[PDB]
Design a protein around this ligand. Structure first.
Ligand SMILES: Nc1ncnc2c1ncn2[C@@H]1O[C@H](CSCC[C@H](N)C(=O)O)[C@@H](O)[C@H]1O
Ligand SMILES: Nc1ncnc2c1ncn2[C@@H]1O[C@H](CSCC[C@H](N)C(=O)O)[C@@H](O)[C@H]1O
Ligand SMILES: [Cl-]
Ligand SMILES: [Cl-]
Ligand SMILES: [Cl-]
Lengths: 444, 448
């Protein structure tokens, strides 16, 4: 072992930073967030320090490095661009047995600052001794994506319940299993975060009442339009905690690979009624069910209908929104849905009853047709017949955001022509913003 | 932050443990692996301390607590079962400004020892501060089943190459690009774990030979509507690796905590558009990875087109990471789906304040959900115009303030109440008009 990680209590402990530039500013933010009684000594200071000083958050000492400033200090940081000053600081700290970091020379003095994932009171720290800061940030990134934002509130509450769980769960197998469902209970975490103290007390007693077997709940998760990177952090966390994942064709294979093989998978790509009962049945057997749907669950996803089935049965649910096809395709095709005065509104529209064509034909809109390929010849002839100018730009985006994305574009009088040239899943975008693609297309 | 994690170099530094039982032994073992010069002061010692002392790996002092034994120490650990003694140790260490752990009292004294996942020289440390040692242990096992055991050898080889990387690559960006390739090369990791130095050298030689692009980049990243969990995985990657992050006030606080700690951050809240464009242009022309972090989605009422056309006109590369737009986030978190069955044919995302003006006949049409962005100040005009162009007076409306955050507020009513409803909230807020608003009483799962 090269270094021993320790977690220091710095509240109201004198710490010293030498330096007043951006390096020192980054270190000082860290120590302020830890509650240090912070002094900063530098020949000059950047404006952020005077701001902190005027708010009484720290003390500034302008001038050359003064070793007597280390007199009552617990930690020192050398954060200048001058190697002779940093060596003076680390030498004075060493002789006082004060742990010291030289920012630009991690093996020069006595401690290294790791990458930190803060879920206080829960904290994770990653370092490799300065041999590989890029690896440390790469690992920090994975951990940040995995650890729910409000886990620390759950950790705090867990400690207050340590006594109750022991008196109810005899063996450590049992309370280990209790703690495992406790730390993944979404209703509890959001109830703690929202300061809804009655939902806390309801969730708390429901967690003690039900069998350890039962963790029944459904999460509707929007998987985004295809690219696995367009899943949300919460969405990834939910599919990592699922007992059962119910998905269909419009969920990309790259998304499905982020589900651990330890979860049951149920493929329902079958009228809507059957899907509703599947979710019902598996939530009532007490499993964590994630219903994965393409894009956003509440935008032509029939997501509402599945949740109404669950409401009439008393099964907790939540929804994780996702990137709808329009947003994904817009960003990845270089076609902004709005721009300057081009469009006062964006219309997301499907392809008994039928569409209001005069309304769709009006100016200053971006039109986005979902499930519109089969009707694309109709859409061309009717938009023209209802006054939309023949030179209106149109684009069709197929498999948007994925490695198979194809974009075709022209004007409206060639819209029906370009539509047989693509296949589902495809969006039809009509409007002046379509012209912007020649400049903004950064993708395939 | 409850604690500040630091990684201490203990080689040849005096450390004191008080106590000689099984707790002290566990801590002594750790401090010996770290290379500490270790004294153990205790009334009695379990046999393992005899084994260590015979080998000359530490100094035993048999007797009650000797405060003067702290005088040259960098760390102290109180590991007795006597809380009077433990607190004398903590007090003596405090006066000397020596960080001190009381093992049976995490909240007392001045450092805590975390759980350690060892892939030396790579190390991960986890602690919940004694609030939930069960959580720390569950997390410690997940981290174990996540970090490959190859990883220590990749990190060790990186350490050996750092001098050559600094010599051969002039700029900081080049060195970063090298390391970013180095750490994801699976063949190199396999060859290191196999001690196949022929393969190690050939892959390494090729890595050093690749042209490294020096161009700065600008990434437009949608931060989503507030909740940090609604950032995309790709958006998180970009802000974890940017040099500079240019962020609005419509980017929540929790999102900014996800920026890498050593990134520079430039505020552009309330500055006009051509201020922002130029700030991006220049830091990008400095060869730095720039992330432009905007609320919601960058291409929905975000003015992301204008910033990018300036960079295209100047030869600067760029990309766009979409985000959850306010309509989708507030929809999910208020229990108001934007489409549903027969209710809504179409969703309209509309801006509220503009220059000619809005096409109210168009907006008043039945079977749609209207979502007004930036429309608070015109709520009275919206109600009057939609009524005048034939929308039913009892049409449900909702206003979502600070959607998806812990401060989210929802008010709802009918169209004839829209103007007064808007006075009960402030920016940032959405106006939702449509029959789907009535679904809230069955689909609301978040709060109120
Ligand atoms: N990756 C993709 N590229 C282009 N269009 C897509 C797409 N994924 C879904 N779509 C569109 O969405 C339609 C299915 S309806 C479901 C839409 C989803 N809830 C969402 O928010 O996007 C398809 O007919 C297609 O037009
Ligand atoms: N968290 C939130 N809750 C409610 N409305 C929000 C919001 N965040 C942004 N908005 C809306 O967005 C308007 C700014 S326009 C910026 C919109 C952003 N690009 C997006 O895609 O959502 C605000 O006036 C408000 O109407
Ligand atoms: Cl160094
Ligand atoms: Cl490192
Ligand atoms: Cl022993």
């Amino acid at each position: 072992m090269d270094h021993l990680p320790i977690f220091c209590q710095l509240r109201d402990r004198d710490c010293l930073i030498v330096g007043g530039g951006d390096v020192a500013e980054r270190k000082a933010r860290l120590l302020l967030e830890a509650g240090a009684r912070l002094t900063v000594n530098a020949l000059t200071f950047i404006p952020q320090f005077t701001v902190w000083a005027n708010e009484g958050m720290l003390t500034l000492v302008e001038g050359p490095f003064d070793e007597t400033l280390l007199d009552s200090c617990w930690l020192a940081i050398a954060a200048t661009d001058d190697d002779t000053v940093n060596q003076r600081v680390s030498d004075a700290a060493e002789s006082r047995r004060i742990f010291c970091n030289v920012v630009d020379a991690p093996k020069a003095a006595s401690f290294i600052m790791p990458s930190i994932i803060d879920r206080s009171p829960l904290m994770v720290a990653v370092s490799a001794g300065g041999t590989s800061p890029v690896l440390a940030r790469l690992l920090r990134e994975k951990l940040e994506s995995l650890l729910p934002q409000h886990l620390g509130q759950v950790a705090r509450y867990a400690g207050q319940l340590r006594a109750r769980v022991k008196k109810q769960f005899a063996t450590m197998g049992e309370r280990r299993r209790f703690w495992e469902k406790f730390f993944v209970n979404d209703r509890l975490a959001q109830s703690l975060a929202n300061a809804d103290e009655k939902a806390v007390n309801a969730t708390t007693e429901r967690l003690f009442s039900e069998p350890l077997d039962h963790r029944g709940e459904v999460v509707l998760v929007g998987a985004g339009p295809g690219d696995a990177g367009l899943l949300t952090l919460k969405g990834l966390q939910q599919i990592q905690q699922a007992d059962i994942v119910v998905y269909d064709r419009l969920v990309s294979d790259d998304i499905m690979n982020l589900v651990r093989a330890d979860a049951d998978r149920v493929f329902v790509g079958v009228p809507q009624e059957e899907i509703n009962q599947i979710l019902l049945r598996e939530a009532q057997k007490g499993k964590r069910v994630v219903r994965l749907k393409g894009g956003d669950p509440f935008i032509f996803g029939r997501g509402g209908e599945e949740l109404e089935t669950l409401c009439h049965a008393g099964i907790p649910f939540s929804v994780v929104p996702g990137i709808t096809a329009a947003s994904g395709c817009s960003a990845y095709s270089g076609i902004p849905l709005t721009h300057r005065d081009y469009a006062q509104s964006v219309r997301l529209v499907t392809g008994g009853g039928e569409l209001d064509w005069e309304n769709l034909a009006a100016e200053k809109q971006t039109l986005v047709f979902y499930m519109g390929l089969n009707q694309a010849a109709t859409i061309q002839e009717k938009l023209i017949a209802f006054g939309m100018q023949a030179d209106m730009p149109v684009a069709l985006v197929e498999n948007g955001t994925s490695v198979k994305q194809r974009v075709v574009h022209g004007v409206l009088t060639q819209l029906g022509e370009l539509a047989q040239q693509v296949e589902s899943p495809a969006l039809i975008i009509v409007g002046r913003v379509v012209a912007l693609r020649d400049k903004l297309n950064w993708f395939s």
